[PDB]
Design a binder for these strands. Structure first.
Ligand SMILES: [Zn+2]
Ligand SMILES: [Zn+2]
Ligand SMILES: [Zn+2]
Lengths: 103, 71, 149, 1165
RNA sequence: AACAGAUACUGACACAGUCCCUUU
RNA sequence: GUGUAGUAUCUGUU
């Protein structure tokens, strides 16, 4: 997601695994969050696709439902040839929201 | 973060970058491009009577220490 | 963004409005105009509409010396889109003047722009580099390109 | 303004020529790689000829190519590394005749980058892993494996990166079922970039490193790293495991070394030097390529030298320890960039510049007259000699280094020819390329009469040669037969008194005589079924068949005959007559699938053809009708799914799909047209005759229409004999001719004339149509200098006190090595040689020759005339002196003037004029000339002692490359800037520039399309068109209106017309041997249609090697107003499902799209 | 220039989420 | 309605 500067990409060398998206993140681009013209499949590194993490959401980590894709603009800009777009951080909004809810 | 992405790649500079190393990167990339394409190598091997293997060997030799020693 | 190819017929209609928006009076107007420029340039890529895109680049370039992160991101996105649509030669010509500026706060911005240009399509930068006259001890001229059959 | 890119000839320059088993059979094929074309070749194992099966285009720069097979497998695969950041595995399909992509994986950005792999493509000898590497820091390993479904799979890449290192070569090590290992020639540069003194640049040596792939732990680790002595350039893999030892052979300058890890003392052997070599002793000596011929009995290597000598390396070893290396001289061939030795004893030599050759190894070259050399022996010499261990069987024509082209009409033909100046070094030549198929005449016999129709029916069906040759006169006949002596048979049983109209093959051995009085049947056996047609209205037309005799009378009175197994004639009681006569009619060949010929087509005066069914129930009863724009002339039916070629009274050929009713009609362009069916390349073709010969062949299910390159003929008949199995017996100008078309030679028949050096430019003398050619080479000797050097060397060798009395000097001065076979004695980086040649282009014989001195490098030529004189031609040659290329520096220059009196056949010296720099361009204008010396532009006029300078200008940015002028406007090409517009003012004598460009360009050539438009090429392979704004007065800038990327450097742009009656086009030729054109659209609807077709094909038919077509065409500048025609024409070879899908997206049927795509090509070219 | 207060604006930013090793 | 990152403009005290 491009709306949170704190998040961090893994972007290691990609493997043969295919990324997945949950219900909330379905139909989006893993780089810019765009609903227009999915173009190319998303692949992730074998460290991300291991054990419990297998078949989870690329963006937030929820249960995987549908495949991930790159939008046409990212493919034109060759932003797809950069490594696994899996997010490794947990974010500041999520933890604070959880703590506020569990107040 | 954009700066982590650009840091890893070889060839990118920053504020405290000198001219010699910039042109060294230019020359190395130019030699690699010459090696890559085919008709440009044919041009170089016709301009001077040398076999393509000799031209490739010379270009590879020039990759180490181009543009002279540093300051 | 929604219309990719059939958007070259409406660049003329919105060009004066974009020029008005990109004027140095307010930050958000320039931010959103830069976003429009980025999306339009990515859309019209490959269909030979570089004439108006050059004018839009000329109008959007003076905004890179900003400090707010959102405007910075919008301007960098617009510059990347214009680099894709126009070609690395024009962007290299633009960024080639301040790359060794005496001020420290200008070289870093020019180097960020140059790195963004360089990571994408460096093999074109090979053919688009400027001639440098060599120094007393260092050879700076690529004599191989001057061979003539 | 949109243009449409087309190609007439593809590149013929081989870069990689790997070999293996790709068809899955026991026959081996060769997969060669042009710059961007992937081609597969199959040499004939009986006649030695090489054939082509697939010529797919990949739209990318191929950087590496290797093949492998999995253990226990039979079919090999193909691995491709290219400019796209992907690795692709391919697989040949003999059934579909196409390449299928099996896998592709992305690992980085696109383009020929420094730190993106794709340069080296080492593969495991067994087939367990593959490795792709970059020039710097990047190495990735993939693991290949098979599944339960008998399909290959690929694993995730394994990284083996290393900072601040350079890679020279990477090869796979044969380890024999152990952990796969890879060896590389690494070299570090970390410290050398940190030593201001500069000694750290020295004392840095290559290190041989081994990378072992740990299959158990799934990671790659480097184990051994030993410094080397010299600098190696490439490695060789030694067959190990069960046969031979492991390790790699390292090739360096003047050395070859064997090394192996663990415990091994290395062995070094010096490379033998040529005896009595004329080269400078300063230079070194390296190998260029190699090969391997491992076999159960033993294995040996082959190696190629710079001079062109093939050695034969044999390793001598203990039980497991190697002891010595044994080098022996095998033969000498032209220098090549890749060699491959196959089974059956064949050697394929892919020359890096020029033609390609195929040799058959007759002897292995052991214990022969020549001695051997070994590392155990304590600088060896050898005597080169003509071929002994090789025999040439085939040659593949190619024009790899095309340097200058000029389309004109220097002969008396009506069609322009192409005069190319290809070639490099002593193998350079000038060729005459003209559209058409080559014709070879063998035997010509004169017939004193007017032969109108001849046939070549065989005596029997199982006979392999045509025994009957019935030459028919106007009122008489002439019978002939095939044999060593062709004569006239008298006792043949044929009544030779009435003219013959056709010769049928009714039975296995039966023939009939067709005359304008009926038909008499004369079978080979003693049986004649005579059947005359009494009356003033005799038979007019005739249609022979393998089992039928269908004829007709006046008024369209058709006659039908059928053969029964008994051997009689069946006449139907029907004589249906139409209102008009027959203009053309014939039967089709009898196919085994159906009983007989499917249908009969009869052309009529009313221009309506009728397709009469051959069933007795509806005999002589039509079933359909078809009209024609003009008078029908022939109705030949071509086989191979069939079509029907129609002849017309006007010079247009019409093809109709096989059907009783008319279907898709294809038209192609004042005399009657006659078609004859012959056997071409094992395929049934046709031969039309409209104004010249026209042979339409269905080669690989593709239809071509290319004329036979010969003078006009009239009649033809197929030829079959032991000497010439495939040919034509033709009659023209009342003589008997023999034709032979064995080699295909699709288009642009070639006739070459040899040269001495690399040609630079040539001009045409307008009065006499003669060429003035200037040649120049670097690192070369003139004749006199090399002769004097030879004399000095012989004197020194005599004085060397080798017994004071040595007889070797006579042999040495009597020893002359043919330079076109043994190469040229390269000397040094400052030497040059040049020569000026006046050549007749109709027949390539020199009419004059002028040799310059040492270090005289010609760079310009011009044929002009001056105002001060009248009828006085002149030749101006620009010459350099003491030119150093890489440390660029020159010492002066000169300009020569000649006189050219005797019809442009003599060159007598007039004077020479010193200049301060090298004159790069000379262009006459307005009775004077321009000479561009360095960055200075000057005007000169003829005098008596020298040329006098009038005007000058010193504002050109850099070196001046070329000059083009029109009217009072002259355009200046620059080495780095694009174009400069400068005007000459006569009243003031000032040259002032008024318009230039914005984008710098390394232009190599320029052509003027109009008063304001210039088309310029580029060093990097781009083509651009630039136009000056209309409101310009001769500061100001020019606007770019077109961009493109051919992918191959262009050295000639020229606008002219190729086919008579067509439209002019912008013909260009490139440095790799390709010939293409750019054409405009005749309608806006056509432009939108082609644009949409290109978009859809780009969408659903991506490039084979993983590149992006639009990104490829926008490699340096974004593409503008050019539509790629190769991608568009790729539609015609796609799968039917995709074809119908795309066509329905086009709102057309696939045949309509095919016709639309073909029409523009057949119009412009 | 630093400390503090107030008012507007951007990010198709998010809303019992849920934890998916927590070890003997 | 609330919380997570930022930004701009005003006012008071040194
Ligand atoms: Zn990852
Ligand atoms: Zn999600
Ligand atoms: Zn995207």
């Amino acid at each position: 997601a491009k709306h949170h500067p704190d998040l961090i990409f893994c972007r290691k060398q990609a493997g043969v695994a295919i990324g997945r998206l949950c219900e909330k993140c379905d139909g989006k681009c893993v780089i810019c969050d765009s609903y227009v013209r999915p173009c190319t499949l998303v692949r992730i590194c074998d460290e991300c696709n291991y054990g419990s993490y297998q078949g989870r959401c690329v963006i937030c980590g929820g249960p995987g439902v549908s495949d991930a894709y790159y939008c046409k603009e990212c493919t034109i800009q060759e932003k797809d040839r950069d490594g696994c777009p899996k997010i490794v951080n947990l974010g500041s909004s999520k933890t604070d929201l959880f703590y506020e809810r569990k107040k | 973060q954009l700066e982590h992405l650009q840091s890893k790649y070889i060839g990118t500079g920053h504020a405290d970058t000198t001219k010699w190393e910039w042109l060294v990167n230019q020359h190395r990339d130019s030699y690699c491009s010459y090696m890559g394409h085919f008709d440009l190598l044919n041009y170089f091997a016709i301009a001077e009577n040398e076999s393509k293997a000799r031209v490739r060997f010379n270009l590879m030799e020039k990759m180490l220490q181009p543009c002279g020693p540093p300051a | 963004e929604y219309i990719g190819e059939m958007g070259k017929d409406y660049i003329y209609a919105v060009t004066p409005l974009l020029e008005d928006a990109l004027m140095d009076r307010d930050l958000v107007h320039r931010q959103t105009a830069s976003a429009v420029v980025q999306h339009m340039s990515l859309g019209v890529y490959g269909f030979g509409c570089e004439d108006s895109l050059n004018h839009l680049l000329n109008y959007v370039w003076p905004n890179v010396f900003e400090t707010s992160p959102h405007v910075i991101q919008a301007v960098m996105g617009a510059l990347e889109g214009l680099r894709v649509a126009i070609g690395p030669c024009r962007m290299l010509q633009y960024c080639l003047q301040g790359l060794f500026h005496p001020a420290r706060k200008v070289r870093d911005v020019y180097w960020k722009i140059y790195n963004s240009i360089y990571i994408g399509s460096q093999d074109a930068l090979i053919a688009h580099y400027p001639r440098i006259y060599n120094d007393d001890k260092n050879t700076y001229i690529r004599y191989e390109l001057d061979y003539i059959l | 303004m949109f243009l449409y890119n087309l190609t007439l000839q593809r590149a013929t320059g081989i870069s990689f020529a790997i070999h293996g088993n790709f068809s899955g059979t026991k026959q081996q094929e060769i997969v060669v790689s042009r710059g961007k074309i992937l081609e597969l070749l199959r040499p004939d194992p009986n006649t030695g000829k090489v054939h082509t099966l697939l010529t797919v285009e990949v739209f990318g720069v191929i950087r590496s190519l290797m093949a492998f097979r999995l253990t226990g497998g039979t079919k090999d695969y193909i691995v491709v590394g290219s400019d796209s950041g992907r690795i692709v595995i391919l697989e040949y399909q003999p059934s579909k005749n196409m390449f299928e992509k099996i896998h592709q994986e992305t690992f980085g950005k696109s383009g020929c980058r420094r730190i993106v792999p794709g340069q080296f493509l080492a593969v495991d000898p067994k087939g367990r892993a593959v490795m792709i590497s970059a020039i710097e820091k990047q190495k990735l390993v993939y693991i290949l494996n098979r599944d339960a479904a008998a399909r290959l799979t690929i694993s995730s890449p394994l990284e083996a990166h290393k900072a601040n290192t350079l890679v020279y070569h990477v090869v796979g090590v044969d380890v024999g079922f152990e952990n796969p290992m890879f060896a590389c020639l690494e070299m570090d540069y970390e410290e050398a970039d940190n030593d201001p003194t500069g000694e750290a640049a020295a004392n840095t040596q290559q290190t041989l490193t081994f990378y072992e792939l740990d299959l158990g732990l799934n990671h790659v680790v480097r184990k051994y790293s030993e410094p080397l002595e010299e600098h190696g350039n490439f490695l060789i893999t030694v067959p190990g495991g069960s046969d031979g030892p492991s390790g790699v052979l390292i090739c360096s300058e003047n050395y070859i070394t064997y090394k192996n890890f663990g415990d091994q003392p290395d062995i070094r052997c010096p490379i033998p030097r040529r005896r009595n070599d004329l080269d400078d002793p300063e230079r070194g000596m390296i190998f260029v390529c190699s090969a391997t011929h491992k076999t159960k009995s033993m294995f040996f290597f082959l190696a190629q030298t710079e001079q062109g000598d093939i050695f034969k390396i044999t390793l001598e070893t203990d039980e497991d320890m190697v002891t010595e290396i044994r080098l022996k001289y095998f033969d000498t061939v032209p220098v090549a960039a890749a060699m491959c030795v196959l089974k059956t004893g064949f050697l394929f030599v892919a020359s890096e510049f020029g033609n390609h050759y195929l040799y058959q190894i007759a002897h292995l070259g052991d214990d022969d007259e020549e001695p051997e050399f070994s590392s155990a022996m304590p600088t060896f010499f050898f005597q080169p000699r003509p071929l002994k261990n090789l025999v040439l069987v085939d040659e593949l024509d190619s024009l790899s280094p095309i340097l200058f082209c000029q389309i004109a009409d220097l002969a008396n033909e009506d069609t322009p020819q192409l005069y190319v100046a290809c070639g490099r070094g002593p193998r350079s030549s000038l060729r005459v390329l003209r559209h058409g198929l080559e014709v070879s005449e063998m035997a010509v016999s004169e017939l004193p009469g007017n032969p109108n129709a001849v046939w070549t029916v065989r005596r029997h069906i199982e006979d392999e040669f045509d025994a009957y040759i019935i030459v028919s006169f106007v009122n008489a006949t002439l019978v002939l037969s095939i044999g060593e002596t062709v004569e006239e048979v008298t006792d043949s049983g044929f009544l030779g008194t009435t003219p013959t109209l056709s010769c049928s093959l009714l039975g296995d051995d039966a023939l009939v005589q067709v005359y304008p009085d009926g038909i008499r049947h004369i079978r080979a056996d003693k049986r004649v079924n005579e059947w005359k047609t009494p009356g003033k209205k005799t038979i007019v037309k005739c249609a022979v068949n393998q089992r039928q005799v269908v004829i007709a009378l006046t008024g369209g009175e058709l006659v039908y005959f059928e053969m029964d197994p008994s051997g009689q004639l069946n006449e139907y009681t029907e004589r249906k007559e139409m209102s008009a006569d027959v203009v053309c009619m014939s039967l089709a060949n009898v196919p085994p699938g159906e009983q007989r010929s499917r249908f009969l087509a009869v052309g009529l005066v009313d221009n309506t053809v009728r397709i009469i069914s051959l069933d007795p129930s509806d005999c002589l009863q039509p079933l359909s009708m078809q009209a024609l724009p003009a008078q029908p002339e022939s109705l030949c039916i071509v086989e191979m799914f069939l079509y029907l070629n129609i002849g017309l009274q006007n010079g247009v050929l019409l093809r109709t799909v096989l059907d009783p009713v008319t279907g898709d009609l294809s038209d192609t362009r004042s005399r009657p047209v006659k078609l004859f069916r012959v056997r071409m390349q094992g395929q049934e073709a046709v031969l039309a005759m409209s104004s010249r010969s026209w042979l339409s062949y269905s080669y690989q299910s593709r239809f071509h229409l290319t004329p036979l390159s010969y003078e006009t003929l009239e009649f033809a008949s197929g030829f079959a004999s032991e000497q010439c199995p495939e040919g034509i017996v033709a009659i023209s100008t009342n003589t008997l001719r023999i034709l032979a078309l064995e080699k295909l030679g699709a288009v642009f028949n070639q006739v070459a004339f040899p040269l001495q050096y690399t040609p630079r430019k040539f001009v045409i003398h307008p009065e006499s149509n003669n060429l003035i050619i200037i040649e120049t080479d670097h690192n070369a000797y003139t004749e006199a200098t090399k002769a004097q050097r030879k004399q000095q060397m012989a004197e020194e060798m005599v004085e060397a006190a080798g017994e004071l009395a040595a007889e070797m000097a006579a042999a040495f001065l009597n020893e002359n090595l043919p330079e076109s076979i043994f190469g040229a004695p390269k000397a040094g980086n400052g030497q040059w040689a040049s020569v000026i040649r006046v050549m007749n282009p109709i027949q390539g014989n020199t009419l004059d020759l002028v040799q310059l001195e040492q270090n005289e490098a010609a760079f310009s030529v011009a044929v002009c005339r001056f105002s001060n004189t009248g009828e006085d031609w002149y030749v101006l040659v620009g010459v350099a002196k003491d030119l150093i290329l890489n440390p660029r520096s020159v010492a002066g220059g000169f300009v020569y003037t000649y006189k050219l009196v005797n019809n442009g056949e003599k060159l007598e010296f007039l004077h020479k004029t010193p200049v301060e720099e090298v004159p790069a361009a000379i262009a006459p204008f307005q009775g004077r000339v321009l000479i561009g010396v360095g960055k200075l532009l000057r005007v000169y006029d003829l005098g008596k002692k020298k040329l006098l300078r009038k005007c000058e200008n010193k504002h050109i940015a850099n070196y001046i490359s070329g000059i083009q002028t029109i009217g009072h406007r002259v355009i200046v090409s620059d080495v780095q800037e694009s174009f400069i517009w400068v005007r000459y003012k006569r009243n003031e004598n000032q040259l002032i520039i008024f318009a230039d460009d914005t984008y710098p360009r390394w232009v190599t050539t320029a052509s003027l399309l109009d008063y304001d438009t210039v088309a310029g090429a580029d060093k990097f392979g781009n083509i651009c068109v630039v136009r000056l704004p209309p409101n310009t007065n001769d500061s100001q800038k020019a606007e770019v209106i077109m961009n493109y990327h051919v992918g191959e450097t262009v050295l000639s742009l020229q606008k002219t017309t190729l086919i008579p009656g067509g439209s002019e086009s912008l013909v260009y030729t490139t440095l790799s041997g390709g010939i293409g054109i750019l054409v405009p659209f005749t309608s806006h609807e056509d432009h939108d249609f082609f644009q949409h077709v290109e978009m859809h094909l780009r969408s659903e038919h991506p490039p084979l090697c993983g590149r992006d077509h639009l990104s490829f065409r926008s490699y340096y500048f974004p593409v503008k107003n050019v539509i790629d025609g190769d991608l568009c024409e790729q539609f015609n070879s796609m799968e039917p499902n995709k074809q119908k899908n795309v066509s329905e997206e086009l709102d057309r049927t696939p045949p309509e799209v095919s016709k639309k795509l073909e029409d523009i090509r057949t119009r412009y070219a």
